[PDB]
Amino acid sequence: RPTFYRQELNKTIWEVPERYQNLSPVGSGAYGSVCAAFDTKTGHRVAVKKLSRPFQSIIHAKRTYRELRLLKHMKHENVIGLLDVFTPARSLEEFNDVYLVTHLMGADLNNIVKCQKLTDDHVQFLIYQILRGLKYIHSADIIHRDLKPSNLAVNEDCELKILDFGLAYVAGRWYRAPEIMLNWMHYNQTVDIWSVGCIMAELLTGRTLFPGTDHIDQLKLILRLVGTPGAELLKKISLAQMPKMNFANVFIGANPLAVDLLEKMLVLDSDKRITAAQALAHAYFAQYHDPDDEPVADPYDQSFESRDLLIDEWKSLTYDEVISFVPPPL
Amino acid sequence: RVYPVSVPYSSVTLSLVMP
Ligand SMILES: Nc1nccc(-c2c(-c3ccc(F)cc3)ncn2C2CCNCC2)n1
């Protein structure tokens, strides 16, 4: 067991191994806050998240077990993984706080588009990386379901990572598939591809595609572009009968190869939307499309999800996961 | 409404500026 040290940051105390140094807050993450730190064991900059009251609420123990389960399973270049997980507690009886750590990324796509324009080469590569992540994630039966620009971490080298997947406010409404926002069906994995559509269009243009003002306006903006629901549609669960825009006419000056993909992703009927694995092979990504480098995740056990156990068992399950953690090859 | 691209499509390594 390494020696820890304490220090208060945004008015809470952090207890970390000596290896992580010069800890500095960088904002909020899912159910906690995160610091950028220097790892004196490896020489790399890392991001450290300390989760909030992990075993206070019942959801919290479940939410805390859930994240650490997902983060221990995700091993992919475009998907945030765990370099390390630690707690200051020396046995289960004092197990109270949990810290997660990952490679430090410099920005998220919200900050990028808010300070630059982006070429077709940029959106080519960025979008590419998201659906490689999504292929991997979807392949383990995990849905992001809240995919949005602030959930996409990026580097100075244009490298992208998905985070906060499988864990699920005002901003987030813009990228949600319609059937989810308004509880139309049971949600399948393509829900994320809708978000991908919204993001790609917003990366190209610089402006949010469907900035709906409330639940009602959102649909109006939705239907304004993609058209009214076709034949089936209502057979899968009263306003103006708008027609479907020819996407080429909206995204002027775009690579026509890019708009054809946008057309395939922003299809109202979930059954019709393109899939991540499908979307990868399309010709817009032909420059980066490499079937021999687009891997699938190992099977991942979600059995605990249907399970109703006590917080002390959830806590023991997480502590078990913390203890069993095997750091990656240095 | 139509939405044109930030940089119009033109018919070799990528980077972004960090905040
Ligand atoms: N700068 C950076 N780099 C990597 C990740 C994060 C991060 C995490 C997160 C997840 C797991 C982990 F182990 C460590 C951090 N959660 C939210 N965020 C960012 C979300 C966008 N701006 C605030 C921080 N931030």
Author numbering:
A (entry chain A): 5 to 172, 182 to 250, 261 to 353
B (entry chain B): 384 to 394, 403 to 410
From the paper:
Protein p38α is a stress-activated serine/threonine kinase that relays extracellular signals to coordinate cellular responses. p38α is ubiquitously expressed, involved in numerous signaling networks and essential for cellular homeostasis, development and survival (1–3). The kinase activity of p38α is controlled by the phosphorylation of two key residues within the activation segment, Thr180 and Tyr182. Typically, these events are executed in trans by dual-specificity upstream kinases, mitogen-activated protein kinase kinase (MAP2K) 3 (MKK3) or 6 (MKK6). However, under certain circumstances, p38α can autophosphorylate these key residues in cis, an event triggered by binding to a scaffold protein, transforming growth factor β-activated protein kinase binding protein 1 (TAB1).
TAB1 binding also causes residues Tyr182 to Thr185 to extend into a short α-helical segment, accompanied by hydrogen bond formation between the side chains of Thr185 in the activation segment and Asp150 of the HRD motif. Based on the crystal structure of the p38α-TAB1 complex we replaced threonine 185 of p38α with glycine (T185G) to prevent an intramolecular hydrogen bond with Asp150 from being formed. In our biophysical and crystallographic experiments, we have used a peptide spanning residues 384 to 412 of TAB1 [TAB1(384–412)], and we have previously shown that no other residue beyond this region is involved in the interaction with p38α and that the peptide can recapitulate the behavior of full-length TAB1 in vivo. The mutation of p38α does not affect the TAB1 interaction, and in both structures TAB1 binds in a bipartite manner on the kinase C lobe and induces conformational changes that propagate through p38α: the N- and C-terminal lobes of p38α move toward each other, causing significant closure around the ATP-binding pocket. In contrast to this, in the T185G structure the majority of the activation loop is disordered and not visible (residues 173 to 181); the first turn of the helix from Tyr182 to Gly185 is still present as tyrosine 182 forms a crystal contact stabilizing this arrangement, but the helix has relaxed away from aspartic acid 150 and there is a substantial increase in the B factors of the helix residues. Moreover, the T185G mutation has had a profound impact on both the absolute B factor and B-factor distribution. The center of the T185G mutant complex close to the hinge region is still reasonably well ordered, but there is a strong correlation between distance from the hinge and increased average residue B factor, as opposed to the case for the wt structure. Consistent with these data, we propose that TAB1 in both structures causes the N and the C lobes of p38α to move toward each other, but the key hydrogen bond formed by threonine 185 and aspartic acid 150 is then required to lock the two domains together in the closed state.
